[model samples]
Target chain A: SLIRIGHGFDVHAFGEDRPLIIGGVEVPYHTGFIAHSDGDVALHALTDAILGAAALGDIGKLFPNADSRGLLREAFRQVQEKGYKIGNVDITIIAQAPKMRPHIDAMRAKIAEDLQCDIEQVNVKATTTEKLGFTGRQEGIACEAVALLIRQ
Target chain B: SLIRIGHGFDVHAFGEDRPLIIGGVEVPYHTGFIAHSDGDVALHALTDAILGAAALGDIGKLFPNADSRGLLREAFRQVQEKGYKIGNVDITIIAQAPKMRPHIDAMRAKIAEDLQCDIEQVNVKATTTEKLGFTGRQEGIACEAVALLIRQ
Candidate 1:
């Protein structure tokens, strides 16, 4: 099977009164991301990763102000149409506030379901900057993801 | 054969007492990363990438507050035991200080040696956040890495 790799990165500033959504799961938080959509940074990164691996354009060019959950499903479908199946996807969420550990499993399951892959094929991890950056100060949250695709 | 992909992200605050160790190569810099071990953000991220690919958890769970050099060697060994050899690794370092271009080649060579992969299988890139984030403010350095592994 032919294997290809892709990576993606995204950031969104924190804003009040908006629910924090990551990987399509709403996590209770005092602040949320400021974006056109629900601001699921994890899915956004994953979308870019899949697109990049297929040598397609990024999410920004593919979708705008679209629901991230639906965007991801559509993106994966498109990749499947191109004759590739997900090998695996790994993502790292960078934030300082509202511990993500509690929500990681749910996020992973949601992503796997969206991509129509086994839960083990998707991994999500979170880390803090140890109080040294915009994320450390809780100004914003960022995520980076990598994806591998194999020819079907 | 199965293909897997992993992603890693790490950040270290800049401090006075430490030396800037990145990708196991010490570079001339006025500030360094404050950590219990020699904080090479690049290597830390790469280690996480390999571990994540094999569904073996993350760097923090695998290594204590130890030297990143040792951490990487051990991580690769564990992955090898799992019947996976690295296909390629691509890394990006985000920082605002101490231009990384000069040390990029040396870092790549050191990482290739540690992972027991060919130099052509490793790629290192650096970017500034355009003065937008903590890295732009020079408060810390961050790195993101992606690794592809093929079952041996």
Candidate 2:
């Protein structure tokens, strides 16, 4: 049983005159994500997922948020330090504005590059909340990620 | 790689006089989960995680609402039929009330039994939103799950 699954979720409120960064790609949007730290919320979620799978606590315990693109890279190194190779990481972007379909492939490429895995090993998908809640009303965005770690 | 990871998220508002079911265990609470259907929201989230890993659409596509206990069981069948085995499933229950610490073991057991996997292969963890958002306000509950599937 040298394998594990971990889930991570992150949400942010929309801030005026900020950048909408997802994965490592800067998505085009009027408002940006405002959180405890200013960085890519999607990558932050993915970082937590990798850390959670390694049983290595979460992003708050480590990166916190100073550097988020490297947030994924840092967790990648930490998990590797723990003797676990990321099998794959899947992400779902739940947002109501600025459709993700156009940026999904680039997002996947960026994550695969960060994890040092094949592009096929990284999957990114976009979904809407059917206009039901916070994300539905575009008050904010929520990103979810799952990571699988396999022991060497 | 014959391996995959999936993430599922579900949110529901609180309702009066309804049963608060989580992981098939009825938690004692003054309020219940209100959603498209009535059942266990935790199980519903986990079911989608398994189906997402198997690329079998989502829970709403099939078994939209009835028999949630068997919902996990049915997704287990679909993955096994697709030549995959459940490696492990991890769940996170985000709530502000009822103190889930006492009931995590039972949940893991119930999920393990449904997946026909060892108890060690199933893990359940509870966390809170730190009173930041809707879940933190106790206006609703959000459950998240991640599953790892291995090819046979």
Candidate 3:
């Protein structure tokens, strides 16, 4: 098949003493994600989606030795080298505390740059869980991603 | 854009006495999802993905008077009518119990049928949070989905 799709999901508990960074953009917040190697939930989930479409396992297993935004870049690099081009990526961040809309444009630009694809090919959105669970309770932030890849 | 991607996430709290239905299949369990119109977490998330990709809306808002699997079918119908065909859909269910592996094939078949697409165009996976949060603690089940659509 020339086309394939993949799904990604990641979550991190909120930490009181850390700085919040998501989608490669930092937000001024009272809390940040508990650091697991510069925890950027958005990039991590996005990377997983790319890896998943390329049949290359997840971000945690593939990038055990390194970074977040850098890992996402490398993930797309491997996908491109494998003769697959990205069609589009859609990502959603679920959190209660911080609003993601303001940072979405920057996130899109950063993701597009990392994937070496058109900015229009990447989209980012955010929503709250309506006080339903961990994210809704503001205990942490969660992100989900989907990527479409076309075999070249 | 000829190709578009969408992300969907849904969560439900566990109720002591309710039928546990997922992916149009029922499972033997001690607890079930709190009913929000049939309470099929998997199908709900999948429907949202379809609606998001078609730029229609979400399951809750779109199907105010409806059901789960049926709502999913209707959402996909709208997508098809809008000149978008399903490229693929990848869904992951997060829960600490009930073992989704055994029910995966049936779920895939049900989802593919709901979308009126080939079974190969739909994929389902299951994972747990390793006792990290609500899902890990079995407080509820959460599902995430990603869909790719191609303009016809």
Candidate 4:
């Protein structure tokens, strides 16, 4: 009985001149995401996935974002505290601009480091709707992530 | 704690001139889809739902066409690797041209075998958009899936 799955999605609008960070790493160009503490939609979604799989609720439950401290590493630490390991993480970043292919490896590395897992266990992909949906409008960025976890 | 929820969605244009494949089986006398693989959007979406629920990730990450080996078997393999067994998989294929009822069982068998699970654990259904969206226009096909996973 080692398998568990969770799905999470997040979206954020572009903010003032801030570094774009995702999967715990900052991108080279483009405006950063708007949020309380270094808005990383990819990591946020990944956090929710682990929480959901563990039946521990979701990101909003563990990290209320009401304060600055809880905004950063607290959520991830909480998951580790619950005795589960990230077996794999798959995430998709939906944005019309800011080509993400070049940074996918960096993002994967960041997530792997945070989750204490091997890089092969994490995957990241980027796609657009050919200028079709909300993401196509470039209003902001949307991310979806799924995680495989094993209870320790 | 045993009850879990998963959702899957797939859409394909009708004029693609490719045979419509749902749940790994081909539907007879139906309009096709525009896609790289067999275009079994239904199964693909279902795969995402199950993997996402298990925290294993989505179909694209598990089986990206860019990776020469990306295929349905890879998805099934990853799900099994995670340790959770499939409790059930329900899919809704949205299309006006294809008659899904006739080939639902064959599709189920295909998935069950891939997951190495019992046939009863998989369910497939079809519906129409009632003349709305691209699906209703017969311009494409759309599919949705929900899966339940449980510890063995």
Candidate 5:
């Protein structure tokens, strides 16, 4: 079996009155991300991870300020077309506010659905800097994602 | 054939009177991480990645404030014992100080040795947050890692 891996990191500051869409799951929060699109950092990072693994550039190159849901689906489609399928994707959300545990399951399901993979193939974990950084200060949120691709 | 993927993240604040050990390679620096252990954020993150990929819990669960060198060796041993060999490990160190470029090669070599894998299977990358966050402010250093594992 041929295996490839990629990693991605992204950060977005808090914005007023924007819906917090992380991993395609809209969270009930007062502040959202400041971005050109939905600013779903989770999906954006994951998209970049897959692209990076395939050496096909990054999300910025493929979709500048593009819709998060569509961009992710399109990226997965491209990966599959290239004779590779997603083996698994694991992500970590670094934030300091609005606990993510309640929304993790929804986020995982959304990502798995977008990638056309089993829910078990997607894992989402959240962590804070233990009140030690910008994320710990509630100024913004950061996300990192890693994806594994296997030859089909 | 089965493949698994895992992701890990770690951060350590800068402190005085400690050796700056990252990825098990001691760097000649004025400041080091303030932690109970040797404070190697690089190796700690990589260990979490391997554990996450194997669904065997995390570094904190297995080894809390443990020595970086010994913790990494033990983590890999456990992963191998479970019938999975590391396909590749990729890591990114996010920091604004002490240029990591010069130490990338040494870090990779050190990680490969601890994991008992080839140097080609280990990759180390470094980046800055463009002076936007805690890392930008030089308050601390952070590391992220992703590991690919294949069942033998």
Candidate 6:
């Protein structure tokens, strides 16, 4: 009846030097994460968080990697089906390289558009482990997201 | 009712040998965790997430470590006093040494019992940064918890 919190986490390895995709936008980078879909770990995490809060299961259940035509905005559609609206989404992307400050706004805008909410409802933050972990090693990108939603 | 999601994160530095406590259980080891009151970062973070989701302020407000009465299961009792039930909690403890697997089951049981939930409802996992970060460097242990709850 009131506010609820949902959290999602995802990690993918950079492969074949593809475009670094994050927050549903392609960032200029040396390598990209390998995934069955667009490899936007940020969006994937947010999408799952929304679903989790809505009691609609997780991203894997709604849009499995093996399923075709379930990529992109399909994740958002799953959340909508649960009768929940994204009140706000916050995320922290951890990495040692590829500064994300310049592209954060773009990521927020993309998420707002996908969720069909105002840009003010979504926030994205980035930080690094000072070259300490897998992300710091530049082996992969890890993203954690929290979503607040209410029944509409 | 369906499951609702909540997220929490906590950090503690490794210092003078003390009692390593987690999930409301005293751990047997040479070193004790650093904190104000039996520093159980795992339970503290879990309590915060539960309180945050229930719109019940936070751990600091309910159980200030500085307060003489705020110790032991005081925080957990406060959370239970609110109108919510624990669904499941997943915790990740990042540490390079001091294998945590053996103690995970005990931790889960203790947390579930404290929260008055089924043992299966609490999930505890451990991971290493591959010897990276503070945990990897053996500087300290950091834990992150996500809980699912249903307002009853």
Best by TM-score: 1
Model 5 CA deviation exceeding 4 Å by range:
A1-4, A18-36, A55-67, A97-106, A130-133, B1-6, B15-38, B55-57, B60-74, B88-137
Candidate No. with top DockQ: 1
Ranking by TM-score: 1, 5, 3, 2, 4, 6
Candidate number that wins on DockQ, 3 or 6: 3
lDDT of 3 by residue, A1-152 (tens): 68878888888886765468999998756555437666678898899999999899988666543468889888888888899988888777778755555677798889889988887677676655545676767778888888888886
Runs of candidate 2 with Cα error greater than 4 angstroms are: A1-86, A96-137, A149-152, B16-34, B99-102
TM-score of chain A of 2: 0.83
Instruction: Give lDDT tens digits, candidate 1, residues B1-152.
Output: 37788888888887774468899998756554346657688998999899888767677666535679889998899999989998999999988866778999999999999989899999999988888777888777888888888888
Cα lDDT of model 5 by residue, B25-77, tens digit: 99866544336667688898898788778756556556544578788888888
| lDDT against the true structure, each candidate | 0.83, 0.77, 0.78, 0.65, 0.81, 0.65
lDDT of 3 by residue, B73-151 (tens): 7888887888888999999888887566888999889888777789999999988899877788777778888787888
What tens digits encode model 2's per-residue C-alpha lDDT throughout B67-129?
687777888898799888888888988887767889889988988889888999988888887
Better of 2 and 5 by DockQ: 5
DockQ of model 1, rounded to 2 decimals: 0.46
- Against the true structure, what is each candidate's TM-score? 0.77, 0.59, 0.60, 0.58, 0.66, 0.55
Candidate 6, A32-142: lDDT as tens digits: 332465656777667666665554445545533543224426756765666667788898888777667999999888778878899999899998988877787787776
DockQ of each: 0.46, 0.20, 0.22, 0.11, 0.27, 0.10
Which whole-number lDDT from 0 to 100 does residue A16 have in model 6? 65
User: Cα deviation of B148 in candidate 1 (Å)?
Assistant: 2.0
Residues A1-152, candidate 4, lDDT per residue (tens digit)?
Answer: 46677878888776666467789998755455535645677777777777787777877776336432343256557666777776666676667765566777787777777777777667665544334345556767777766667665
Chain B TM-score of every predicted model: 0.84, 0.83, 0.83, 0.76, 0.83, 0.75
Candidate 1 global TM-score: 0.77
Candidate 4 wrong stretches, greater than 4 Å: A1-4, A13-39, A62-72, A95-99, A127-131, A136-140, B1-38, B46-70, B73-102, B112-118, B125-152
Q: Which 10 consecutive residues of model 6 chain B have the lowest summed lDDT?
A: B63-72
Candidate ordering by DockQ (highest first): 1, 5, 3, 2, 4, 6
Model 5, global lDDT: 0.81
